[PDB]
């Protein structure tokens, strides 16, 4: 039947146009454009706890603002608070500042007004302050290249360019 052949051809064109229109609005919705170099994760009032390869609480960073980046793996803290733990059950140190940077290699860096208290009330070392300080939470080794001030319970000193670790309380400078 010639009329029925034309009707079928018309149904072909109709189906094709409809599904072309659906595909067009799909591509308009399937426009997944890759994002730009910006903080991929953000949070406020954060407490991020980190553990060692055996399951023991290594340290705690309590900050008011945290931004995790993807390309480099640098995690920027605003006003961080770092609690170091000996075997997880004893909070030995507590190190704070206004700005911090974690790295993919687990290397922290603290900039504006650094404070560092020792929760051991009998060891003779109580408080430490400096401008900028980097510490490797894994090894606990820390570097500082700017003014340093130490306050002991009966002895206070003032120097610069310190390098130690909270692992063993090994401190070293000149």
């Amino acid at each position: 039947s010639l009329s029925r052949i034309v009707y079928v051809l018309l149904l072909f064109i109709a189906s094709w146009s409809l599904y072309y229109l659906l595909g067009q609005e799909q591509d308009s919705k399937i426009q997944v454009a890759p994002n730009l170099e910006l903080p991929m994760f953000s949070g406020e009032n954060l407490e991020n706890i980190s553990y060692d390869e055996q399951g023991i609480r290594n340290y705690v960073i309590t900050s008011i603002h945290l931004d995790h980046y993807a390309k480099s793996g640098n995690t920027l803290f605003k006003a961080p608070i770092l609690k170091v733990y000996r075997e997880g059950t004893l909070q030995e140190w507590e190190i704070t500042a206004r700005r911090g940077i974690l790295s993919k290699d687990q290397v922290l860096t603290l900039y504006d007004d650094v404070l560092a208290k020792n929760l051991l009330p009998d060891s003779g070392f109580d408080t430490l302050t400096t401008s900028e300080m980097s510490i490797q939470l894994k090894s606990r080794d820390f570097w500082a290249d700017k003014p340093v001030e130490l306050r002991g319970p009966q002895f206070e000193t003032h120097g610069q360019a310190m390098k130690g670790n909270f692992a063993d309380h090994s401190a070293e400078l000149y």
Binding site: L11, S15, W16, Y19, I49, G55, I56, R57, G88
Partner: protein, 354 residues
């Protein structure tokens, strides 16, 4: 029970609804074929595989279209009898309008049996076969089940490879009443031992305590007492309307057991239950038309009224569905509410004739 006038009306009505139903599946079929043309040549998906997909998906179209087909079939067949003066002389010789209506119902019975048999065995198995064939042909050996997620109460499970009764690379996360993660399980391979019980080989289990202790144990085997059977897993990805009846019933039982909202699947279950009721309502509405307004009108006006009534029924179905669950009503009522409404219309139109 076997009355000549019964099977006479029946034979004319099924003849007409068969024609109507062939025509409907033909038109939906060629539309599906252009949809498959939208994405041919992907992997091994040549035009033969697309034609194969369209042919396989036919019984699901038949189930979806059987209600309206029986509306139009009854309308045309009874209109035929009507216009050749056969119904009039049937009444003028004793056969009442009540008897005509019982003839229509007696021949609605086999149609209801066929549509439930389709809903149970034919359309779901054929639909899963079309989907699987299309996916395998379309990705050249990339689709069984790779990347499966599931939930059992507060547990979240992720399986990497799923076989007939074996899982490969299981991960599982448990959460407590405080919505925090307590235990995590991983296993290279898990097998299905008995009813509602799995066995994981060389499984590593991690538990969290006091936010200072995390202890993992490399157990040779671990027993899993979940209400999540492998059948249920293999059906968490298909559309509920495509799942069989007994499958829907087992799935709503599992959903109710795992403390999950089983409304949508209950609604799909009751919609599969009420599909045959809908086709009987559709045939009585046709009889109400043939006796009522469309008594001495041309077949074209009967067919156009039937199309309008079928379209309005489909819309009412797609409306009563969600509103029954968002307003808190049993899915049974949300499923059979359109059937009731059109039944009331049919009885109203037959209230003065019958």
């Amino acid at each position: 029970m076997f009355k000549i006038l019964d099977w006479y009306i029946g034979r004319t009505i099924v003849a007409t609804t068969a024609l109507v139903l062939v025509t409907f599946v033909g038109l939906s079929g060629i539309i599906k074929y252009v949809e498959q043309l939208r994405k041919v040549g992907e992997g091994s998906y040549d035009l033969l595989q697309a034609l194969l997909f369209v042919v396989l998906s036919i019984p699901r179209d038949v189930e979806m279209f059987f209600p309206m087909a029986a509306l139009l079939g009854a309308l045309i067949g009874l209109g035929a009898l009507a216009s050749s003066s056969e119904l009039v002389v049937m009444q003028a010789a004793g056969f009442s309008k009540l008897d005509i209506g019982l003839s229509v119902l007696k021949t609605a019975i086999p149609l209801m049996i066929i549509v439930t048999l389709l809903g149970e065995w034919g359309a779901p198995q054929a639909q899963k076969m079309a989907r699987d064939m299309r996916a395998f042909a379309t990705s050249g050996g990339a689709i069984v089940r790779t990347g499966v997620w599931a939930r059992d109460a507060n547990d979240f499970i992720f399986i990497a490879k799923v076989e007939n009764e074996h899982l490969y690379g299981l991960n599982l996360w448990r959460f407590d009443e405080n919505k925090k993660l307590s235990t995590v399980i991983f296993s290279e391979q898990v097998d299905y031992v008995a009813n509602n019980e799995w066995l994981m080989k060389d499984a590593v289990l991690t538990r969290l305590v006091n936010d200072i202790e995390i202890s993992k144990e490399s157990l040779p085997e671990y027993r899993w007492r979940t209400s999540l059977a492998p059948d249920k897993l293999a059906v968490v990805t298909v559309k509920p309307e495509e799942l069989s009846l007994t499958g829907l019933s087992d799935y709503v039982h599992y959903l109710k057991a795992s403390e999950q909202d089983s409304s949508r699947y209950e609604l799909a279950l009751w919609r599969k239950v009420t599909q045959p009721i809908s086709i009987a309502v559709m045939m009585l509405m046709a009889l109400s038309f043939i006796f009522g307004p469309l008594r001495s009108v041309t077949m074209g006006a009967r067919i156009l009224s039937g199309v309008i009534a079928g379209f309005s029924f489909y819309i009412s179905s797609e409306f009563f569905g969600p509103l029954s669950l968002v307003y808190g009503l049993p899915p049974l009522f949300g499923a059979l509410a359109p059937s009731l409404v059109f039944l009331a219309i049919a009885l109203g139109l037959l209230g003065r004739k019958l």
